[PDB]
């Protein structure tokens, strides 16, 4: 037994980074447009590519398209990948996020990646980053925390933009406070720091911008996680 | 801005470690006793004293008694302490935990320590540790997970014995797997390693015991600096 063990991160590829960007919604869903969410999308895809990830963005899928896509990635072989990143940029409530047209419960999504129905990912980090609250040239919009900040399973790392009782801020040009600080830290420390250290650094950054916003992460990781180049 | 900034842990005292131990309950509650919770209580209490905490254990308090104690603490000054620690060992459902006689919402207890109601702690780590799940020689009991693993506010670290979809194990003589292991890591590394680093080691040790269903622990961190318990001695 060794206190400094790391996840094996020397497979051939680093892995897929899925990004579900949601800016607009069915009309009858009566949800606000999330202006500035593109800032985030592109930001993250820059930051994640730099780390070696194959980034795949999807904007405004309806539930069925979204379900089809995430099942399509959960059945390919992740045998020669390091880990798996998945990102949601939407509105949400309780334990649902919104596609363009309806809500899906998060656990049906993350569930596709437990050891059960994805053997190639066992023993590997699975990172879910949720930027999802409840609403509602550069302006600062404020949504209320609403998505319950909970986990998902062995070797998962749930990353929440804002916890219960706080508020998530989003600038209409620059993007979400939390995605900005996350990307800025990935910019500087992605390649050196242990991923959760980095996440505590984002905790300090966001909570220091002047209704506080205070992020949160839930870790069920069994090892230290670095993204050393390659 | 420093990436290796730590919490200031050089105060006069390390702080207080509350422990609420619940072994039995009022009988019109129809809850199993928690045989073994005593080793848990006693194990935690050795280790947290070794780290310099003033441990304070209470057994089987009632809702009214429990609220008293805990307000009592939230109000005494903490300006000369590093951090605060709370442990709950008991039964729980949802975002509720059980005293002797009735459940309590977990957030009236934690929210008692948010900046606005306890400024002596603002800026300092607040750690809550929760062994709580739903209950049915050295027999080994198996509870289903029930308490919502969710955080509180700034500078809080929430620690859960078990996360949704898994089961908490308790050995009648030995104690809870979760505590058993956490105490072992605190033993070997508590004074060296960073606490979340140590927490993730327990995640590994725990998710690797068998006997036919898994236990997987969970911590939710809203800490903003690194957290160490370097010896003061």
CB proximity B161 to A under 8 Å: no
C-alpha A18/C-alpha B30 separation (Å) is 47
**In the numeric block, which tokens belong to residue A56?**
């795949």
Provide the shortest C-alpha distance from residue A28 to chain B (in Å).
Answer: 32
Contacts of B217 in chain A (CB under 8 A): 220
Q: How many helices (H) and strands (E) does chain A have?
A: 5, 11
Residue B139, burial from CB neighbour count under 10 angstroms (0-12, 13-18, 19+): exposed
Whether chain A has a CB inside 8 Å of the CB on B152: the answer is: yes
B221:A196 CB<8 A? yes
Query: Resolution, rounded to a tenth of an Å?
Result: 2.9
Distance CA A171, CA B89 (A): 43
- A201 contacts on B by Cβ (under 8 Å): 3
Tokens, residue B157: 């670290």
Alpha-carbon torsion angle A121, A122, A124, A128, nearest 10: 70
Tell me how far apart the alpha carbons of residues B204 and B221 are, in angstroms, rounded to a whole number. 17
CB distance B221–A163 less than 8 Å? no
Distance CA B73, CA A69 (A): 52
Q: DSSP states of A187-225 as a string?
A: HHHTTTS-HHHHHHHHHHHHHT-------EEEE--SSB-
What contacts B83, CB < 8 A, 6 or more positions away?
Answer: B7, B9, B14, B15, B121, B124, B125, B126, B127, B227
Of B43, B59, B15, B5, nearest to B194 by C-alpha is B5
Alpha-carbon distance A221 to nearest alpha carbon in chain B (angstroms): 6
Paired tokens of A57: 């963005």
Interface membership of A149 toward B (CB under 8 Å): yes
For A123, name the nearest residue in chain B, comparing CA atoms only. Answer: B204
Taking CA–CA distances from B222, the nearest residue in chain A reads: A216
Q: In whole angstroms, what is the distance from residue B176 CA to residue B36 CA?
A: 7
Of A86, A82, A17, A12, nearest in space to A45 by CA? A17
Closest CB from B3, B148, B223 relative to A189: B3
- Dig out the tokens for B108 from the structure: 């009236």
Q: What residues contact A221, with CB distance under 8 A and at least 6 apart?
A: A7, A125, A155, A156, A157, A196, B200, B203
Q: Which residues of B214-233 are buried (b: 16+ CB within 10 A; e: fewer)?
A: bbbbbbbbbbbbbbbbeeee
Calculate Rg over the CA atoms of chain A.
17
Q: Cα–Cα distance between A112 and A38 in angstroms, integer?
A: 27
C-alpha dist (Å) from residue A24 to A18, A37, A133, A144, A180: 19, 10, 14, 18, 21
DSSP state of A130: E
* Whole-number Å distance between alpha carbons of B6 and B12: 17
Question: What does chain B look like in DSSP terms, one character per residue?
Answer: --TT-B----SSB--EEEEEE-----GGG-----TTHHHHHHHHHHHHHHTT-EEEEEES--HHHHHHHHHHHHHS--TTBS-EEEEEEEEEEBTEEE-SSSEEEHHHHHGGGSGGG-TTTTTS-EEEEEEEEE-----EEEEEE-B-----STTEEEEES--TTSEEEEETTTEEHHHHHHHHHHHHHTTTS-HHHHHHHHHHHHTT---------EEEE---SB-------
Compare all CA atoms of chain B with the CA of A159 and give the residue at the minimum distance: B220
Count of domains in chain B? 1
- Residue A228's SS3 state is coil
Collect all residues of chain B within an 8 Å Cβ-Cβ radius of residue A190.
none
Q: By the 8 A CB rule, do A207 and B224 touch? A: yes
DSSP-assigned letters across all residues of A156-184? EEEEESS-TT-EEEEETTTEEHHHHHHHH
CATH of the domain at B77: 3.40.50.1460
CA distance B20 to chain A (A): 24
Dihedral sign (CA B65, B71, B76, B79): positive
Q: What is the DSSP letter of A123?
A: T
Instruction: Compute the distance between CA of residue A219 and CA of residue A96 in angstroms, rounded to an integer.
Output: 20
**Rounded-to-integer distance, Cα A200 and Cα B155, Å:** 10
Contact A219 B222 (CB under 8 A): no
Residues 92-121 of A with CB under 8 A from B: 107
Instruction: Classify the C-alpha dihedral B5-B8-B14-B15 as positive or negative.
Output: negative
How near does any CA of chain B get to the CA of A204, in Å? Answer: 5
The answer to whether B196 faces chain A, any CB pair under 8 Å, is: yes
Q: Which of A122, A147, A162, A214 to mutate to test the interface with B (most CBs of B within 10 A)?
A: A214
Residue range(s) defining the domain that contains residue B142: 1-233
Which chain B positions have a beta carbon within 8 Å of A223's beta carbon? 200, 204
Estimate the share of chain A in helix, then strand, then coil, as percent rounded to the nearest 5.
Answer: 25, 30, 45
Q: Which residue in B has a C-alpha nearest to residue A7's C-alpha?
A: B204
Structure tokens, A226: 């670095």
- On the CB side of B30, CA atoms within 13 Å amount to 2
Whether the CB of A50 is below 8 Å from some CB of chain B: the reply is: no
Reported for B42-50, long-range contacts at CB under 8 A and 24+ positions apart, including other chains, are B43/B175, B43/B179, B43/B180, B43/B183, B44/B17, B44/B19, B44/B87, B44/B129, B44/B179, B44/B183, B45/B17, B45/B19, B46/B183, B47/B183, B47/B186, B47/B187, B47/B190, B48/B17, B48/B85, B48/B186, B50/B186, B50/B187, B50/B190
């Amino acid at each position: 037994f060794d206190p400094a063990e790391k996840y094996k991160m020397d497979h051939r590829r680093r892995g897929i980074a899925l990004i579900f960007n949601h800016e607009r919604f069915f009309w009858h869903l009566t949800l606000p447009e999330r202006r500035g969410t593109c800032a985030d999308r592109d930001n993250l895809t820059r930051r994640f590519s730099d780390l070696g990830f194959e980034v795949k963005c999807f904007n405004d899928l309806k539930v069925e398209e979204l379900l089809l896509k995430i099942h399509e990635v959960s059945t390919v072989s992740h045998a020669d990948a390091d880990c798996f990143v998945c990102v949601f940029l939407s509105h949400g409530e309780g334990n649902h996020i919104y596609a363009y047209d309806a809500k899906i419960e998060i656990q049906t999504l993350t569930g596709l990646f437990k050891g059960d129905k994805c053997h190639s990912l066992v023993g590997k980090p699975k990172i879910f980053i949720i930027q999802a609250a409840r609403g509602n040239t550069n302006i600062t919009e404020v949504d209320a925390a609403s998505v319950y900040t909970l986990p998902a399973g062995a070797d998962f790392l749930m990353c929440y933009s804002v916890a219960e009782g706080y508020y998530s801020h989003r600038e209409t040009v620059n993007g979400s406070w939390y995605i900005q600080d996350l990307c800025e830290m990935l910019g500087k420390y992605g390649s050196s720091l242990e991923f959760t250290e980095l996440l505590t650094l984002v905790n300090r950054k966001v909570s220091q911008r002047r209704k506080k916003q205070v992020p949160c992460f839930a870790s069920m990781l069994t090892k230290k996680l670095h993204f050393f180049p390659k």
